[PDB]
Amino acid sequence: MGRILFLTTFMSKGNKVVRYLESLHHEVVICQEKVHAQSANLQEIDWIVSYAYGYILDKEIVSRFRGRIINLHPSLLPWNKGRDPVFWSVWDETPKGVTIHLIDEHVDTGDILVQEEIAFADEDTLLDCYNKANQAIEELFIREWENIVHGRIAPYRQTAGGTLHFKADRDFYKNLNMTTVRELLALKRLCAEPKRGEKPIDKTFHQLFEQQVEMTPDHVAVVDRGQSLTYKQLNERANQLAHHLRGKGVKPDDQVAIMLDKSLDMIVSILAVMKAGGAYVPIDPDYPGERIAYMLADSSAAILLTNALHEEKANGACDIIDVHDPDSYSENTNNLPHVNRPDDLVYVMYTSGSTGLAKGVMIEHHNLVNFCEWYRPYFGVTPADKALVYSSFSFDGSALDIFTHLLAGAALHIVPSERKYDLDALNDYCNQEGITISYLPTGAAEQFMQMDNQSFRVVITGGDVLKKIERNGTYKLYNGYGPTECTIMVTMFEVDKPYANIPIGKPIDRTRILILDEALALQPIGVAGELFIVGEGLGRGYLNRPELTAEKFIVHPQTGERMYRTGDRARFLPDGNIEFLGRLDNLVKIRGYRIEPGEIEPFLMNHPLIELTTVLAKEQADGRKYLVGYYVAPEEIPHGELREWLGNDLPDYMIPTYFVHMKAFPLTANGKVDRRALPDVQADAELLGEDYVAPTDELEQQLAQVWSHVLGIPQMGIDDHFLERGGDSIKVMQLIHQLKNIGLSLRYDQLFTHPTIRQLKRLLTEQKQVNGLLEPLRELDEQAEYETSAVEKRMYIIQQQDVESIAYNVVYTINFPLTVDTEQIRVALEQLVLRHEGLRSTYHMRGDEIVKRIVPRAELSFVRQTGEEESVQSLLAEQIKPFDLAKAPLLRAGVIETADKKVLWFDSHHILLDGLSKSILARELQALLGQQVLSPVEKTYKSFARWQNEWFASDEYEQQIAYWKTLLQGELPAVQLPTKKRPPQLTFDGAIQMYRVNPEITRKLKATAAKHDLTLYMLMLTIVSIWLSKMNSDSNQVILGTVTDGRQHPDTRELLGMFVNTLPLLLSIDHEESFLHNLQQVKAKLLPALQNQYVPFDKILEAARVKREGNRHPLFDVMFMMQGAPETELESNMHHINAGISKFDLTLEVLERENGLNIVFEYNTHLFDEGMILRMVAQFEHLLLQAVHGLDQQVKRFELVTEDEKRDLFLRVNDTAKAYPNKLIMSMLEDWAAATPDKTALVFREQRVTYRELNERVNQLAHTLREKGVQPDDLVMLMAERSVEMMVAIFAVLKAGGAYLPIDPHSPAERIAYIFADSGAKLVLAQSPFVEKASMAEVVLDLNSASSYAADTSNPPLVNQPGDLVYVMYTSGSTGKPKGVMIEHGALLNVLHGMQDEYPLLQDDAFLLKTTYIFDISVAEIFGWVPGRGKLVILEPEAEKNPKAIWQAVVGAGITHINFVPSMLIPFVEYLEGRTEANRLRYILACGEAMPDELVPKVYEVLPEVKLENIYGPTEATIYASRYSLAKGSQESPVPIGKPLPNYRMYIINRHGQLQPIGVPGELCIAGASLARGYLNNPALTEEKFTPHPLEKGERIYRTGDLARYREDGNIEYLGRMDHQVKIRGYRIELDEIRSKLIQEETIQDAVVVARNDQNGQAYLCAYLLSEQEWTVGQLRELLRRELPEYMIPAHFVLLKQFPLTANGKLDRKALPEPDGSVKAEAEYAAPRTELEATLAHIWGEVLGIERIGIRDNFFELGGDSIKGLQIASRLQRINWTMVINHLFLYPTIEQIAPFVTSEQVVIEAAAENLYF
Ligand SMILES: *P(=O)(O)OCC(C)(C)[C@@H](O)C(N)=O
């Protein structure tokens, strides 16, 4: 050992590494500060270990301790050196790992000692990768420190390469800590500066235009009125005016104004200024004369291009160049020499309408070129297109209309103001001229969608928020976004489907969009922020406004890129698109809620009458703001209708206060809706619309003031709904308490039946006035010990079962800015310690009573630590320690300070801190940190405990107990969630998963509940109940737990203590009714439970007499909680920490945060994993969206399984399509017999039949059957044993045309006469011993008489289609008389081809005919050899029971394929174990019953190289349906029946016909090609079992009646019949688990487990066993009590010798002994009456070794052998007690053999001692 100097700055002082070094008994000196070269901490030091050290050691220290300074770096060096290594490992996509290296004089450039490779997942957050890396570097140290300190590791130098990163290089990506890895990279690809990007722009617009004029010179360029201009004509004319302009003094970057109207000369003038070298300044001729003069002076334009009509509008301010004067055009028509560069200005357009007069935005040539070169290929603009010059030329909308289409050869069409505003005439012009593409502003576009257009193919819109997508046209709709400072637009989106917020799209060419926060840092995907624009669109800036240019056009402080502040809020969507979220200044406060008014307009325009809408947020002089909803409709809409239409999806404050009807929205001269031209409302004096009905009396006024105090709404109306205007459960109790001071009593349920003041008055009329119903809480006097509450006694008892448990520790974290004083927080916390007695309360136990003791003062543990982002969790973890309830304070605090935040953490116990106590602790701490004075407390918790304990003696408490004792009586429901194997003991290890409900859906949830007199909790509880029901196999009742506030006395809502109470909720789900009906039923069961909510949970368990199990929590196993919105801002920034604990199997907590819902899924990690919970979270979201949109839909119509799961099930299971030859099996025989007539086909006994001999004899009987009246789909019955004649009959039946119906010859006459009639058949092909057995039914032939054959040996003609019957197999199933399954040829062919693809029987192979032909399995043996042209070895009749004969057939005939039903394979492998004969066997195909798990190794040990296969299939699916290949080294927990065969499909549905997900059980259904036509002469049963289903799209499915479940692998698991199911209080059980112990018992070879209903009806768990030993009940019970719990412990164990199998080898559950019988059981104890028995008990105790022997104990049960009896009889003989060893077998007990053991009386009278002499 040696001294170690541990250097850490951002890690803990007692890390996992430091304390492991102390376990090895090292002296670990810890120094967190900068160490000097000659310090005391450097003396007598042998090793230096560093872990997150934030300083650089001196160069002397590195050399003085060279080879002795070890560093722990969580990065795979040389990659990611320096600071923040784990983040840069993910962002730069470097290799991942951890490194323990040596320290040199640089940053992480030392020789590596040990290095491991870590793996991060795509769905892991960055914080998750931080913990996973910190653990690896700590585990790597623990694993290798001994090898390091002992020199058993040679340092190897770092390989070449790697990255180096410093501090503050991450400041741009600070918000992305909770972002997944795949989303972090997705943002990188979407926002990182591209390497090479695109080619740099090197052209101006007039350069590219002049090149297009050379390409399409005679194409039509511009069309105005009826005249037209070609590209050459337009080019030459502009060149003429440009020569004049340049000669007049036009230089590059000069600004030439243009004041013309939309005409051909406008296009000429624009191109002329460009060709001259300047930039055109568009001035609308209709502007005010002051606006015109402002632009001319601001632009400093010396030349103005106008005509004579608008000439005087300049007032002689410029050199007027008339566009109609011929002298203004020169004679030179050639292109001018180029004097411009791509950096020169191309146009200047002024924008305004707000702050400032007007600002001149300057755009350059490269800006416009980049847009036009993106516009043409994006929309496919060709010279065949025709565009519309719609927008005013003073705005970039015209730049898109003109410049983009000119560079593609298209034609421009000028729009006069006669059609610019009459959109009906514009649609006429477009349809009659062929206008194919154009840009229309948002307002004009939405009013153009109604017109019937056939000309447009692409219509682009933008400017305002697009909401309308339905249009009367065949054109594609595009939505664009972009400021005027950038070129026209920067993002484009094709509107493909309806959207709530239509995205603005993805950036264009050479353009990148960033979503940044206020600190200019990158926001994660989905997080809102300010939109920034980078790329070639950013112009120069504003004209003569350099301050505003430097304000909006900024270079980024870190990325070093020029960006434009848009002032708009947007977020990135996961698809890569951007969506507009509003302007950063248009956020207004309505009723105390910050809302975006743009979120109201889409719902209002969805009204069937509203076409346009705009919601403004005006204000009054008092300061309050009100929302006004302007709408354009054909006529006015009543105020109540618009209030109701928006009340379906929006809250009350988002419903506008007033609505204004408009006929046409006033547009500005620029295409936008004139917002300041909308009519201001007249009633703007705090008017409450019109639904306001003023209070008419003194009670309605008194109720309106109480409602105003609780809800915070001024002037309430008597018709206002409580829940609709912010009403909550807490606010209902506040209304009740506020009425108690008035004197009126209101119950909690009566508010939901009287939700308005109008109804509340009518209820409070009969209610008495001033009575003082509420009594004040009496403050207890000072005592030594105080009383504890019922919940405090429970929480105490909980913490006592494991005194070191943190399962009830309450840990929260708040992230403060670094500017907050750490000690100021500690002082505020120490003030809260004395303010509340709970923070100074200690709990002890006086005898058997738990009492509380108050302490005057207690010191607070405030641990200040320094940490990094990637270590805050590990630091906080090491602080969560168990609490001693006898010591105060029950709360520990501390602040972890990082380089960017101060993380305050506090850990308390649930005995003190509950839901409301957290809210009060937040408000008081926030006020103390704000230096606000607090009013001292008035009440204490110790006094409420006294008041409540006395209420436990009242009559109302007994009345509430009687509720729970009757509510929870009888058999309660059982919720079997699809969990993993439940551990024997209850486990508390857990994890969480979070699901966010967006604000929009949250608003629709709360508006729905309030509209139907429900709370959000009632609505969520119904969805949770349905969600649990559908997972519990669509049960009708469910059970779950909930949490109430438990604040009984109204004076306790300001105290700090444990008040919450747990309530069981027994709810019912009616799947046949609507979602609204179930909503009322959940409330009808919740309100009576809340009326009895103040009975402690442990008393409720006692009243119900709930039995305690080990695997499940008592009563319920799923918990559902819900908290309200945070009261303060500090509570909203608090974060609840879970220390890997799940108190229940599954816990759901709904938290109202950020105007949305954060739903937590706390689950036990032993029952669920990461994948299972993710499925259930998606299913809850799927049910929530279906329910909120289907209020009136039946609950049965809501599906649980998701579409991604349905596609996953299709591929892994039901993708079995394969093309198979349609050649029938009777033709394949005659085809093979033709090619190979002299090949062996059948082998019976020791005789062989060739293909020709077989086919010829088949033809003779066929020709005989043909003339007998055999046609397709005719039935002929067979009565023959296993022989060659049976095979000839079957094939001759098929060749003749009919189907063969197998009948056992040895079947009773009662059975045949049934099939003889049900089938209606006539011919009976029977053998000689069974000819008269048909009783001459009709025409009976003799298969052994040559008269029944013919002489024609030629193949009969083909007379069968693939849809004709091939055989009819009767079932004789349980609970029913035999039914004839009709199988067709194509159905049989698909299975034979399918089984040949998996187990190919080739020509050199053979099959064994051993299954009785009245079973479908035999058919696979009858025809299984034909496809591969093999052979069939017919076993001797009744030789299927002799494993000797079966094994001889496999050896002698080289059989490769064999069928074996289980329970018949076990006797076969029991014969082959002591065998060694050679075998050609390849496949053992098992079918008929469930395969025992122990049989798989038994088969592979007696037969290596074989392929054991478990196969399942009902008779209605021909032969088989699914298969599963079993391997050697395998131990499957059941025997999965596997996946369906080719062209087979299997579905597992519930009781409502919905596909069940993985793990959830249901009914197995078959579908595909090989389905039976139906049941013979039973169309009723055919409809019940062969039903059409939407899964097969109208095609039939066969309902097997078997219970089954999907597995994560995809193989289906057999769970037994749907009927004959055994449950344990609803929670079911698997009998195979009980049959495990029977196999574990070596002497118990085989045994079965079922049930039997007793005389009264209760089924007892009867087990049937056979073995070589005699047991007892007690011995068999104890052997099961190993791991099998008591709820599965059976009872009657009747001993058997063989199992009652039937003809199919399965043990008849009926034929099992019904009334038990030979159930071995023990007797009582002992009573050695006489000393003889006591002597017998002592001698038995010595020989048998049993220290306690009873007089009624069986000799053999205590270890009685034949050797023991001789010892016992010998010891008795030595004390004169004759015992016969034979009697011990007849009388095996002491008392039974006591009268039979006699004495050896030796008399001892002697010979007459009186002797003489
Ligand atoms: P409302 O039923 O929505 O309130 C929710 C509960 C029942 C949790 C609340 O009343 C409470 N803390 O008891």
PDB file of N, CA and C in Angstrom, residues 1337-1361:
ATOM      1  N   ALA A1337     -75.196 -50.031 -46.506  1.00  0.00           N
ATOM      2  CA  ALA A1337     -75.738 -48.676 -46.497  1.00  0.00           C
ATOM      3  C   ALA A1337     -76.241 -48.282 -47.880  1.00  0.00           C
ATOM      4  N   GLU A1338     -75.357 -48.332 -48.874  1.00  0.00           N
ATOM      5  CA  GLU A1338     -75.771 -48.192 -50.263  1.00  0.00           C
ATOM      6  C   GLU A1338     -75.050 -49.235 -51.105  1.00  0.00           C
ATOM      7  N   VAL A1339     -74.101 -48.806 -51.928  1.00  0.00           N
ATOM      8  CA  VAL A1339     -73.283 -49.718 -52.716  1.00  0.00           C
ATOM      9  C   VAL A1339     -71.927 -49.817 -52.032  1.00  0.00           C
ATOM     10  N   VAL A1340     -71.626 -50.990 -51.485  1.00  0.00           N
ATOM     11  CA  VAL A1340     -70.398 -51.228 -50.736  1.00  0.00           C
ATOM     12  C   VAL A1340     -69.518 -52.161 -51.554  1.00  0.00           C
ATOM     13  N   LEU A1341     -68.305 -51.714 -51.857  1.00  0.00           N
ATOM     14  CA  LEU A1341     -67.334 -52.522 -52.578  1.00  0.00           C
ATOM     15  C   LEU A1341     -66.395 -53.219 -51.600  1.00  0.00           C
ATOM     16  N   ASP A1342     -65.584 -54.127 -52.140  1.00  0.00           N
ATOM     17  CA  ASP A1342     -64.626 -54.903 -51.360  1.00  0.00           C
ATOM     18  C   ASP A1342     -63.237 -54.655 -51.933  1.00  0.00           C
ATOM     19  N   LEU A1343     -62.374 -54.012 -51.143  1.00  0.00           N
ATOM     20  CA  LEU A1343     -61.023 -53.709 -51.599  1.00  0.00           C
ATOM     21  C   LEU A1343     -60.171 -54.960 -51.772  1.00  0.00           C
ATOM     22  N   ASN A1344     -60.578 -56.088 -51.191  1.00  0.00           N
ATOM     23  CA  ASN A1344     -59.835 -57.333 -51.334  1.00  0.00           C
ATOM     24  C   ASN A1344     -60.405 -58.255 -52.401  1.00  0.00           C
ATOM     25  N   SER A1345     -61.628 -58.006 -52.860  1.00  0.00           N
ATOM     26  CA  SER A1345     -62.238 -58.800 -53.917  1.00  0.00           C
ATOM     27  C   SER A1345     -61.878 -58.211 -55.274  1.00  0.00           C
ATOM     28  N   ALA A1346     -61.356 -59.056 -56.165  1.00  0.00           N
ATOM     29  CA  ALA A1346     -60.969 -58.608 -57.497  1.00  0.00           C
ATOM     30  C   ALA A1346     -62.157 -58.179 -58.347  1.00  0.00           C
ATOM     31  N   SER A1347     -63.384 -58.521 -57.944  1.00  0.00           N
ATOM     32  CA  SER A1347     -64.557 -58.091 -58.698  1.00  0.00           C
ATOM     33  C   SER A1347     -64.769 -56.587 -58.596  1.00  0.00           C
ATOM     34  N   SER A1348     -64.416 -55.987 -57.457  1.00  0.00           N
ATOM     35  CA  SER A1348     -64.547 -54.546 -57.276  1.00  0.00           C
ATOM     36  C   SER A1348     -63.495 -53.755 -58.040  1.00  0.00           C
ATOM     37  N   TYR A1349     -62.606 -54.423 -58.766  1.00  0.00           N
ATOM     38  CA  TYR A1349     -61.603 -53.779 -59.598  1.00  0.00           C
ATOM     39  C   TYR A1349     -61.957 -53.968 -61.067  1.00  0.00           C
ATOM     40  N   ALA A1350     -61.213 -53.282 -61.926  1.00  0.00           N
ATOM     41  CA  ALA A1350     -61.425 -53.328 -63.365  1.00  0.00           C
ATOM     42  C   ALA A1350     -60.175 -53.864 -64.055  1.00  0.00           C
ATOM     43  N   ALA A1351     -60.255 -53.977 -65.380  1.00  0.00           N
ATOM     44  CA  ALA A1351     -59.138 -54.454 -66.182  1.00  0.00           C
ATOM     45  C   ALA A1351     -58.351 -53.333 -66.845  1.00  0.00           C
ATOM     46  N   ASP A1352     -58.913 -52.130 -66.922  1.00  0.00           N
ATOM     47  CA  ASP A1352     -58.242 -51.012 -67.573  1.00  0.00           C
ATOM     48  C   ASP A1352     -57.149 -50.471 -66.660  1.00  0.00           C
ATOM     49  N   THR A1353     -55.899 -50.554 -67.117  1.00  0.00           N
ATOM     50  CA  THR A1353     -54.750 -50.075 -66.362  1.00  0.00           C
ATOM     51  C   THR A1353     -54.254 -48.720 -66.854  1.00  0.00           C
ATOM     52  N   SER A1354     -55.063 -48.010 -67.634  1.00  0.00           N
ATOM     53  CA  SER A1354     -54.687 -46.703 -68.150  1.00  0.00           C
ATOM     54  C   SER A1354     -55.152 -45.604 -67.204  1.00  0.00           C
ATOM     55  N   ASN A1355     -54.405 -44.506 -67.189  1.00  0.00           N
ATOM     56  CA  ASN A1355     -54.709 -43.384 -66.311  1.00  0.00           C
ATOM     57  C   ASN A1355     -56.070 -42.789 -66.655  1.00  0.00           C
ATOM     58  N   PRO A1356     -57.004 -42.718 -65.708  1.00  0.00           N
ATOM     59  CA  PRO A1356     -58.284 -42.085 -65.995  1.00  0.00           C
ATOM     60  C   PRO A1356     -58.089 -40.602 -66.282  1.00  0.00           C
ATOM     61  N   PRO A1357     -58.989 -40.002 -67.052  1.00  0.00           N
ATOM     62  CA  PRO A1357     -58.823 -38.586 -67.401  1.00  0.00           C
ATOM     63  C   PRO A1357     -58.995 -37.679 -66.192  1.00  0.00           C
ATOM     64  N   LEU A1358     -58.378 -36.505 -66.289  1.00  0.00           N
ATOM     65  CA  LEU A1358     -58.441 -35.521 -65.217  1.00  0.00           C
ATOM     66  C   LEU A1358     -59.832 -34.901 -65.161  1.00  0.00           C
ATOM     67  N   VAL A1359     -60.420 -34.864 -63.964  1.00  0.00           N
ATOM     68  CA  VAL A1359     -61.785 -34.373 -63.792  1.00  0.00           C
ATOM     69  C   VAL A1359     -61.909 -33.544 -62.520  1.00  0.00           C
ATOM     70  N   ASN A1360     -60.799 -32.981 -62.044  1.00  0.00           N
ATOM     71  CA  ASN A1360     -60.794 -32.240 -60.789  1.00  0.00           C
ATOM     72  C   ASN A1360     -60.065 -30.914 -60.949  1.00  0.00           C
ATOM     73  N   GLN A1361     -60.651 -29.863 -60.395  1.00  0.00           N
ATOM     74  CA  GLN A1361     -60.046 -28.544 -60.343  1.00  0.00           C
ATOM     75  C   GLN A1361     -59.407 -28.309 -58.982  1.00  0.00           C
TER      76      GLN A1361
END
